[PDB]
Each structure stands twice: as structure tokens, then as C-alpha cells.
Design a binder for this molecule. Structure first.
Ligand SMILES: OC[C@H]1O[C@@H](S[C@@H]2O[C@H](CO)[C@H](O)[C@H](n3cc(-c4ccsc4)nn3)[C@H]2O)[C@H](O)[C@@H](n2cc(-c3ccsc3)nn2)[C@H]1O
Ligand SMILES: [Cl-]
Length: 137
């Protein structure tokens, strides 16, 4: 698939919706981003950073009216440059639940409350993208 990639989420997200992204991190990657969007707002920005002051960190945030909110940071970093990955995002009633390569990574409490209006997923950054899909579990 071409990156950046836009995956429509028809009628928004709902609990029990599982989104699966398969790809490979490019060699010498710098960043990856998944952006769950409600129009121009970003309900959930998931942003692995491969070199922030020589550390690897995952940053999560929400953008409302073009302004970023309080960052939530995770030091557990399951991505490796050059290697294939699977990201699964499970929508639960109170949070997005993220697993990478079948291991739980983090939860992100819903800041944007109108789940039915979060109708696009943007995928960008330093990856080769193989597949992006969703199903109900
Ligand atoms: O909050 C998320 C946003 O962060 C900003 S960078 C942000 O800048 C601030 C000053 O304006 C602070 O410096 C902030 N900070 C917070 C901390 C901190 C927090 C706790 S200890 C240290 N140390 N830096 C730092 O993260 C990125 O630019 C945004 N971004 C990424 C992308 C993208 C596109 C394609 S792939 C990625 N498109 N927009 C997005 O990730
Ligand atoms: Cl809302």
C-alpha cells in the first residue's frame, strides 16, 4: 500500500472493533504515526519515535482545534528498524487498547467522546505498509 494511507472507518468506531495494521519498519526509521481522525481533530495520535534525544519512545496525544493536548508517553518500545510488525488497535468502551506483535502495549482513555464521528485512520511515517483492515470481534 502507498504511504501515507487513509483507511475510512464507516460510521466511526465502536467497542469490539479491531483494527489490524501489518507492515515493516524501514531501515533507519525515524517515526511512525497512526492518526484516528474526527474531521480535522485527531482523537488518538499514536507516534513511535526512534530517536528523540537518542531514546526510543512512544508518544500518544489528541489534537483539538489544531492544538495538541497533554502527551502520554510509553518507554516500552516493541518496534525495531528493518523488521515486520503487527499493530492491533481494539476499541473498548473507555479506551483504545494497543497490542504490538501480540503483546499488550498500552491503553489510551477516550478524550474525544463522539466515537461514531472518528471516521478516518491515517497511517504515515517510515514504514512499508502491507495491510490495513478492520473486523468486529
Ligand atoms: O504531542 C504530539 C505531537 O508532538 C509534536 S513534537 C512536540 O513539540 C512540543 C513543542 O511544540 C514539545 O517539545 C513536545 N514534548 C513533550 C516532551 C515531554 C513530555 C514529557 S517529558 C518530555 N518533550 N517534547 C514534543 O513532543 C509533533 O511534531 C507532532 N507530530 C508528529 C507528526 C508526524 C507526522 C508524520 S510521522 C509523525 N505530525 N505532528 C505530534 O507528535
Ligand atoms: Cl467529543
Amino acid at each position: 500500500l502507498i504511504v501515507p494511507y487513509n483507511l475510512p472507518l464507516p460510521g466511526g468506531v465502536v467497542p469490539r472493533m479491531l483494527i489490524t495494521i501489518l507492515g515493516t519498519v524501514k531501515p533507519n526509521a525515524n517515526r511512525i504515526a497512526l492518526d484516528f481522525q474526527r474531521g480535522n481533530d485527531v482523537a488518538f495520535h499514536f507516534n513511535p519515535r526512534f530517536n528523540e534525544n537518542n531514546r526510543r519512545v512512544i508518544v500518544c496525544n489528541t489534537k483539538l482545534d489544531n492544538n495538541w493536548g497533554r502527551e502520554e508517553r510509553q518507554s516500552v518500545f516493541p518496534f525495531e528498524s528493518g523488521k515486520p510488525f503487527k499493530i492491533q488497535v481494539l476499541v473498548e468502551p473507555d479506551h483504545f487498547k494497543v497490542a504490538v506483535n501480540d503483546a499488550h502495549l498500552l491503553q489510551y482513555n477516550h478524550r474525544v467522546k463522539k466515537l461514531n464521528e472518528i471516521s478516518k485512520l491515517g497511517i504515515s511515517g517510515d514504514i512499508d505498509l502491507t495491510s490495513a483492515s478492520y473486523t468486529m470481534i
